[PDB]
RNA sequence: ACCAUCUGUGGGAUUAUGACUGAACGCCUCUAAGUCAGAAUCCCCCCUAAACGUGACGAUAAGCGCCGCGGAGCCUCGGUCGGCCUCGGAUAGCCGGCGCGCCGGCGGGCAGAGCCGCUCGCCUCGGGACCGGAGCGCGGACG
RNA sequence: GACGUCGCUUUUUGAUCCUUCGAUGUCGGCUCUUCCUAUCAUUGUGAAGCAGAAUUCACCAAGCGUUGGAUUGUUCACCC
RNA sequence: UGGCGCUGCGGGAUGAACCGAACGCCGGGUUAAGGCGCCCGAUGCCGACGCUCAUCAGACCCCAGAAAAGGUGUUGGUUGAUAUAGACAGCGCCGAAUCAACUAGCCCUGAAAAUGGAUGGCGCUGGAGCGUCGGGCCCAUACCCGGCCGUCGCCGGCGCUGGGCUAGGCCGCG
RNA sequence: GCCGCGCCGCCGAGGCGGGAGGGCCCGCGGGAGCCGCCAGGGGUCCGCGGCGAUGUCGGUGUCCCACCCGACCCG
RNA sequence: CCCAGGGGUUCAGGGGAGUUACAGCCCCCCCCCAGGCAGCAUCGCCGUCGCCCGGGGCCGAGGGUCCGCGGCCUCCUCCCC
């Protein structure tokens, strides 16, 4: 019911153009690891694009002007909002279906995350072109939580790898059981191989 | 790091296009994008074809440069391309994928019943070895 | 379940005009125009719940109401379809579920 | 215009044992080991032959900007070869007119304290890169010796010392004082 | 001309209207490359009108037929001598192409003259096209394929079908 | 009341620029790939404010809080129409198994193009199984 | 940088008369905030007909500062 | 000469004049100009070929900022000149091509103004950029077919009656 | 270039007359006649189902509210 | 089936060891346009709605014959009962 997407390796606008279309169709999308989102062009380009964004403020009262969020999740959230009619009740309901997170929080750490091939860097960008990470771009504009997120993501990959190694033993046990009971499932494996289920 | 190359005689699999699913022999390379393929034993006559719809296979037949279809057919039959392809896992996964798409409602019920008992028998064997190992 | 999942993506519109007498549905599995032919003519239903109870055919009254429609033609190249309902779909249904029935069947 | 194939072969001596893990080249010689990743060049590397090993750097369908990175791969590995067999010996020379440049090496060649440059009281503490050892040269008055296996680390450690002795607000054509690189050689001379 | 789609080699033969003062005017044949014959006739009355004192009204076209490829199954090197008007002036050029059909190479030329020089179809005048052997080719991009036992892989194959699975758990591979 | 007195601050990426390695272009080259130093600028810390943002915790009045899937009912608001309980990532290579090797698999069948769940009930064959499964159940690890 | 020549700016003036004549208070000063850079000074550099000192040219650059007075209503000048 | 004024409609974000097309009230269909990453209907095509990296990239009538002059950025083309009686570059060695001028695309320099801001916005760099094209698709009060209303035109029809002919009525057609 | 003849080429551009047969055709020979059928002067069924007075059915355009789209103040 | 029977020539994206050899390519001749099968089926264009069949959507406005057929008007035979 919830489209959990991993933000690592994806482009900013390529992914936001698709996530904005899913929430308008009444679907709930959760984009994790927004610091891993890539942006085409060298880093100095995208950094200047954000520094020029920092200058856009109401001269008389900056507290009313454009709120410049520094977190990579809120940066990607503002990108998706730009492709939505957020000044209408239909567009505001679409924003309520999207939840962005820096890293992979516990509510989604134990989940299988989707990948959008139409937004990956390997598919949409040349191998020789320059790109930039949203985690470094945010760190150099005021994101104060890059070091704590990197350490928490570091421990998240340790417990995710211990689970994967246990999952590899279960697959080894499952493949071994298929050979030790092949005589009892011979009539069943012939049905699946007959209808193309197995090969 | 590369093992499959585009060369004279390289048997290629057409993923999409008008001849999707058939094997062709790259007899000549026109440009960086297109080639001159010809499948005499498959049903794809000599014609230009882009590389984006080709998928290189592990079969290379010995055909001369710009030889007509009579000699491209000999190397296709000398190397037994159709026999080696039909026994390769590439075609067997294609055959399995085609049969799964032609399954009727009664075929899915027979698969539902077969897979239901096949998993429960394997799942208990996994529990049997776990109890034995401890 | 005997119906296909569809989403009320919006009305038949241009950019500055909206024709509410025609709806654009998005079927969950149809992502190409060459796949919309199967659904041409299928019954559409916008099932929802209200406050007051209404009569139910073949059952007891409840809060469930429905607006029946039918897929008329395809729309674009991405598997979208057009549907006309006896009453124009309310704007609150945009992004909600539309049941695409398997009848009238042609298989 | 895109060239079909652009290759170049690198000769590898018998005392160097090279291992390829994708694009990460690892050379091991009598003077130590080196390891430099080339995953940003996007080329093909291959070791041909068991005896008299070679390194084949291939580039398929590359324009002029991408063909230029082919020899850069080869010239880098050749530096990694002579860095583990012969090494690199960059020699500095302290040039001064009136005030002699006092260089004292500390932390076992990992720190260079430059004193009495143009009579300045400020002390210039230049820390060498990892694996680079600096030493006051013998048989010479104001010569330094920078040794290491990686040319990019020894030549960079020489640029740190040289740019540290920079004259400000003066005619540099008249005030030619500083520690400059005089010779770029090897530790073993064959 | 718009050069829509793949052009066709038309052999348009025409002449002037026979007059009592000068009867039996000579027949003039041209090698027109137009997407259809209606454009091939209009293109004929563009070069003949500027080379000779002939007009569409005072002349007639006796034959406008499509020229088929005599060797469609063979890869041939073509040489196209053409003049085109830039934003500054007119320049003569000689291009080379590898294709199966003469019309498929002239079509490939319009796609190239407009790509590298921003030259539109109305500014290009194809003057001479002839099949050239591999020993008389000048361009390295064409002459690099003149090598038997040619071999090259397909490095970093871009994943097409990006939207057939739009959301998948497996990241695509580019090495095959 | 500088008309008395006290205090006023740390880093990060980098600009200009100077360089390293090194091609293109047998040489050369700060640049093409890759690196270094680098500033009254920029960002941030320090500092002021504290959001239709919020955490921990205390105390919680014949009333009131927990605990009997309370045990039955009356008004209301929305969806929705099987789950997936998870490596890290590479993309000019990857994955699996076995003590830097070897073996095996790659248009991904150890496959998200997938996996898993899925006879209308209630009793009877014993033909295959030892599926010993099922808890408004009682305890113990793991957050 | 002569003879030439190509631009830019809207802090001069002119040209125009589109908005306002059932009215947009109009010069300067004072006060006060913010902005621009076509940088005078300070920060980091490059160049010299840069020995030092002083100065000139150019670059990144508007963070910071650009004062006190005589005369004049004057902006503008001039002088201490 | 057309148009605006006297005129709405689709498109150009926007806007008296531009592009398309002019208007009774509706249904179905099809288009124009213009579009089809998301806002925003449509390419969620396994589109084709190239060009281009921009530390002020670029992004299409009117139209809403550029020039002269430059670049050993990159890609084309043109006209010449040296070279296996051994050139170019580097120290006779080296052993295969090389050099010069000119021209044309894109990018770059030239390129400085004042509240914070404008390919419309988000954003886009195996393209959502520029050029050349293909197939498909999107909708205007335009076009086609159908209903209804009114007007106008019929050398209109009916005084020859179940209904009918208040003929100032009724009916038919375009 | 015209005119005449001859030869030759012309799916069958073809037309006339006749001959051996084979077999494909005709709004020729069938209409002041009875019966039906119907791609024939604009739709019918000589088809059918569910629901039924205290909580339901239809309307409630013009009472309130919600959302999408359009939409700047008249003279 | 190099179609076979006589052969000639020719280069190179040069196979085998420079011109067919342990692959082939091209240009030409005299023998039944050798036969045999396909016919815009890698590449166009167009029909005397061109012949037939099917599917989806939209709606029935009006309300006192024409044009195609078939059976019988002629006797039987067969199938089906
Ligand atoms: Mg630099
Ligand atoms: Mg640095
Ligand atoms: Mg002058
Ligand atoms: Mg400036
Ligand atoms: Mg000085
Ligand atoms: Mg004063
Ligand atoms: Mg007027
Ligand atoms: Mg008028
Ligand atoms: Mg505009
Ligand atoms: Mg319409
Ligand atoms: Mg648009
Ligand atoms: Mg200049
Ligand atoms: Mg520019
Ligand atoms: Mg009509």
Distance (Å, rounded) from C-alpha D157 to C-alpha D128? Answer: 5
Closest-CA residue to C66 (of C82, C50, C83, C42): C50
Structure tokens at E126: 């194809």
A16, A94 Cβ separation under 8 angstroms:
no
Distance (Å, rounded) from C-alpha E26 to C-alpha E130? Answer: 25
Distance (Å, rounded) from C-alpha D91 to C-alpha D182? Answer: 6
CB-based contact, E156 to chain B, within 8 Å: no
Structure tokens at E171: 């990241």
Residue–nucleotide distance: B9 CA to J14 C1' (Å): 18
CB-based contact, E159 to chain B, within 8 Å: no
C86, C69 Cβ separation under 8 angstroms:
yes
Q: How far is CA E133 from the centre of its chain?
A: 18
Distance (Å, rounded) from C-alpha A174 to C-alpha A193? Answer: 18
Say which experimental method was used.
Answer: cryo-EM
The helix (H) or strand (E) run that includes residue C19 is strand C18-27
Residue–nucleotide distance: C22 CA to H171 C1' (Å): 40
Residue B86: phi and psi, rounded to 5, are -65, -25
Closest-CA residue to E171 (of D169, C56, A115): A115
Distance (Å, rounded) from C-alpha E29 to C-alpha B64? Answer: 40
User: Cα dist. C66→C9, C86, C97 in Å?
Assistant: 18, 11, 12
- Long-range CB pairs of A193-196 (<8 Å, 24+ gap) are A193/B96, A194/B99, A195/B99, A195/B100, A195/B103, A195/B107, A195/B108, A195/B110, A195/B111, A196/B95, A196/B96, A196/B97, A196/B98, A196/B99, A196/B100, A196/B101, A196/B103
Residues 6+ apart with CB under 8 A from C45: C3, C66, C67, C68, C69, C98, C99, C101
Residues of B in contact with A199 (CB under 8 A): 89, 92-93, 95-96
Distance (Å, rounded) from C-alpha C90 to C-alpha C80? Answer: 19
The ligand that comes nearest to the alpha carbon of residue D156 is 2
Residues 39-68 of E with CB under 7 A from strand H: none
Distance (Å, rounded) from C-alpha A185 to C-alpha B117? Answer: 8
Nearest to E174 among A5, A9, A122 (CB): A122
Residue C17: phi and psi, rounded to 5, are -140, 150
Distance (Å, rounded) from C-alpha E164 to C-alpha E176? Answer: 20
Structure tokens at D104: 């004292």
Structure tokens at B126: 């996994």
Shortest CA gap B36–chain D (Å): 18
Closest-CA residue to A93 (of C23, C28, C91): C91
**Secondary structure string (H, E, C) spanning C54-99:** ECCCCCCCEEEEEEEEEEEEEECCCCEEEEEECCCCCHHHCCCEEE
D147, D159 Cβ separation under 8 angstroms:
no
Residues of A in contact with C6 (CB under 8 A): none
Closest-CA residue to E97 (of E136, E135, E131): E131
| Three-state DSSP class for residue D3 | strand
DSSP character at residue C39: G
Shortest CA gap E147–chain D (Å): 11
Structure tokens at E13: 């033969």
DSSP character at residue A114: B
Residues 6+ apart with CB under 8 A from B87: none
Cα torsion for D68, D70, D75, D77, to the nearest 10°?
150
Our answer on whether A and E touch (3+ beta-carbon pairs < 8 Å) is yes
DSSP character at residue C52: E
Looking at chain D, which residue has its C-alpha nearest residue E116?
D1
Whether the bond into D111 is cis, omega within 30 of 0: no
Distance D164 CA to ligand 10 centre (A): 80
Strands (E), A60-186: 98-100, 131-133
Q: What is the CA radius of gyration of chain E?
A: 22
Cα torsion for A56, A57, A59, A63, to the nearest 10°?
180
Nearest to B30 among E75, E148, E154 (CB): E75
Cα torsion for D171, D175, D179, D181, to the nearest 10°?
70
Write the DSSP assignment of A2-71 as a string of letters: EEEEE-TTBBHHHHHHHHHHHHHTT-EEEEE-GGG-EEES-HHHHHHHHHHHHH---SS-TTTS-----S
Distance (Å, rounded) from C-alpha C80 to C-alpha C25? Answer: 6
Give the number of residues written for chain C.
Answer: 107
B→A contacts (Cβ < 8 Å), by residue, are 89, 92-93, 95-101, 103, 107-108, 110-111, 114-115, 117-118, 121-122, 125-126, 128-130
Closest-CA residue to A18 (of B54, D33, E168, E171): E168
Write the DSSP assignment of D85-152 as a string of letters: HT-EEEEEEEE-SSSPPEEEEETTTTEEEEE-STT-SS-EEEEPPTT-EEEEPSSSSSEEEEEES-HH
CA geometry: angle at B75 spanning B73 and B80, to 5°?
A: 95
Distance (Å, rounded) from C-alpha A111 to C-alpha A4? Answer: 8
CA geometry: angle at D189 spanning D184 and D190, to 5°?
A: 130
Structure tokens at A23: 């929430």
Distance (Å, rounded) from C-alpha D141 to C-alpha B34? Answer: 69
Closest-CA residue to C36 (of C78, C2, C98, C95): C78
Q: Do B103 and A195 touch (CB under 8 A)?
A: yes
Beta bridge partners of E63: E13
Distance (Å, rounded) from C-alpha A153 to C-alpha A10? Answer: 18
* Residue linked to tokens 């057919």: B73
Distance D177 CA to ligand 7 centre (A): 86
Q: How far is CA E84 from the centre of its chain?
A: 14
A117, A7 Cβ separation under 8 angstroms:
no
Closest-CA residue to B91 (of A31, D66, D124, A199): A199
Classify residue E147 by burial, with Cβ atoms within 10 Å: 0-12, 13-18, 19+.
exposed
A123, A117 Cβ separation under 8 angstroms:
yes
Structure tokens at B96: 């399995």
Distance (Å, rounded) from C-alpha D15 to C-alpha C1? Answer: 73
Distance (Å, rounded) from C-alpha D25 to C-alpha E56? Answer: 72
Residue A170: phi and psi, rounded to 5, are -65, -35
Query: Are β-strands A28-32 and A2-6 bridged in parallel, bridged antiparallel, or unpaired?
Result: parallel
Helix/strand number for chain E, H first, E second = 3, 7
Distance (Å, rounded) from C-alpha D151 to C-alpha D172? Answer: 28
Distance (Å, rounded) from C-alpha D151 to C-alpha C1? Answer: 70
C46, C89 Cβ separation under 8 angstroms:
yes
Residues 6+ apart with CB under 8 A from B119: none
Distance (Å, rounded) from C-alpha D45 to C-alpha D73? Answer: 9
Distance (Å, rounded) from C-alpha E71 to C-alpha B68? Answer: 12
Closest-CA residue to E108 (of E13, E6, E34): E6
DSSP character at residue A84: T
Distance (Å, rounded) from C-alpha D58 to C-alpha D7? Answer: 4
Query: CB count, 10 Å around CB of A161?
Result: 10
């Amino acid at each position: 019911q919830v489209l959990i997407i991993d933000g690592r390796g994806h482009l900013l606008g390529r992914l936001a153009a698709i996530v904005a279309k899913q929430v308008l169709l009444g679907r709930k999308v959760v984009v994790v690891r927004c610091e891993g989102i890539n942006i085409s062009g060298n880093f100095y380009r995208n950094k200047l694009k954000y520094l020029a964004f920092l200058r856009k403020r109401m001269n008389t009262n900056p507290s009313r002007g454009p709120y410049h969020f520094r977190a990579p999740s809120r940066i990607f959230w503002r990108t998706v909002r730009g492709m939505l009619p957020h000044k209408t009740k239909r567009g505001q309901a679409a924003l309520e279906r999207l939840k962005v997170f820096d890293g992979i929080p516990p509510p989604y750490d134990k989940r299988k995350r989707m990948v959008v091939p139409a937004a990956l860097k390997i598919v949409r960008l040349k191998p020789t072109r320059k790109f930039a990470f949203l985690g470094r771009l945010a760190h150099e504009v005021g994101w104060k939580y890059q070091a704590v997120t990197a350490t928490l993501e570091e421990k998240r990959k340790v417990k995710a790898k211990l689970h994967y190694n246990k999952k590899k033993i279960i697959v080894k046990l499952r493949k071994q059981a298929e050979k030790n009971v092949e005589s009892k499932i011979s009539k069943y494996t012939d049905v699946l191989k007959q209808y193309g289920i197995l090969v | 790091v590369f093992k499959r190359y585009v060369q004279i005689g390289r048997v290629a699999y057409l993923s999409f296009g008008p001849h999707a699913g058939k094997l062709v022999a790259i007899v000549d390379v026109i440009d960086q994008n297109r080639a001159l393929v010809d499948g005499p034993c498959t049903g794809v006559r000599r014609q230009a074809m882009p590389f984006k719809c080709m998928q290189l296979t592990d079969f290379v037949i010995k055909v001369p440069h710009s030889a007509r279809q009579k000699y491209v057919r000999r190397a296709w039959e000398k190397a037994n391309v159709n026999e080696k392809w039909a026994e390769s896992s590439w075609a067997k996964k294609i055959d399995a994928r085609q049969r799964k798409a032609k399954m009727s409602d009664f075929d899915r019920f027979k698969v539902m019943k077969a897979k239901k008992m096949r998993n429960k028998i394997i799942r208990h064997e996994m529990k049997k070895l776990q109890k034995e190992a401890t | 379940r005997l119906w296909c999942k569809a989403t009320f993506a919006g009305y038949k519109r241009g950019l500055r005009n909206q024709r509410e007498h025609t709806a654009l549905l998005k079927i969950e599995g149809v992502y190409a125009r060459d796949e919309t032919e199967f659904y041409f003519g299928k019954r559409c239903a916008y099932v929802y719940k209200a406050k007051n109870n209404t009569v139910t055919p073949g059952g007891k009254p409840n809060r469930t109401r429905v607006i029946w429609g039918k897929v008329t033609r395809a729309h674009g190249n991405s598997g979208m379809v057009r549907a006309k309902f006896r009453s124009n779909l309310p704007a609150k249904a945009i992004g909600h579920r539309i049941r695409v029935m398997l009848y009238p069947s042609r298989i | 215009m895109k060239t079909i194939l652009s290759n170049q072969i690198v000769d590898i001596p018998q005392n160097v044992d090279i291992s390829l893990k994708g694009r990460t080249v690892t050379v091991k010689g009598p003077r130590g080991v080196l390891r430099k990743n080339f995953n940003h060049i996007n080329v093909e590397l291959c070791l041909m032959g068991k005896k008299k090993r070679r390194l084949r750097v291939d580039k398929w369908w590359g324009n002029r900007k991408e063909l230029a990175t082919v020899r850069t791969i080869c010239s880098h590995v050749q530096n990694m070869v002579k860095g583990v067999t012969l090494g690199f010996r960059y020699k500095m020379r302290s040039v001064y007119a009136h005030f002699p440049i006092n260089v004292v090496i500390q932390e076992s060649g990992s720190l260079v304290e430059i004193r009495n440059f143009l009579g300045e009281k400020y002390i210039r503490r230049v820390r060498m890169r990892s694996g680079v050892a600096c030493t006051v040269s013998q048989a010479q008055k104001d010569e330094l010796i920078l040794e290491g296996n990686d040319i990019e680390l020894v030549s960079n450690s020489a640029a740190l010392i040289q740019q540290a002795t920079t004259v400000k607000n003066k005619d540099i054509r008249k005030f030619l004082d500083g520690i400059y690189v005089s010779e770029k050689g090897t530790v073993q001379q064959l | 001309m718009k050069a829509s789609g793949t052009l066709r080699e038309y052999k348009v033969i025409g002449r002037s209207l026979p007059t009592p003062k000068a009867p039996s005017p000579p027949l003039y044949r041209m090698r027109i490359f137009a997407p259809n014959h209606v454009v091939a006739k209009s293109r004929f009355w563009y070069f003949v009108s500027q080379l000779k004192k002939m007009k569409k009204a005072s002349g007639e076209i006796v034959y406008c037929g499509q020229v088929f490829e005599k060797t469609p199954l063979k890869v041939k090197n073509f040489g196209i001598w053409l003049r085109y008007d830039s934003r500054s002036g007119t320049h003569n050029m000689y291009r080379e192409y590898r294709d199966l059909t003469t019309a498929a190479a002239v079509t490939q030329c319009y796609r190239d003259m407009g790509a590298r020089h921003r030259a539109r179809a109305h500014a290009i005048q194809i003057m001479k096209v002839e099949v050239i052997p591999a020993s008389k080719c000048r361009r390295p991009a064409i002459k690099q394929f003149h090598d038997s036992k040619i071999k090259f892989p397909l490095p970093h194959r871009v994943l097409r079908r990006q939207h057939k699975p739009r959301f998948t758990t497996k990241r695509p591979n580019t090495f095959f």
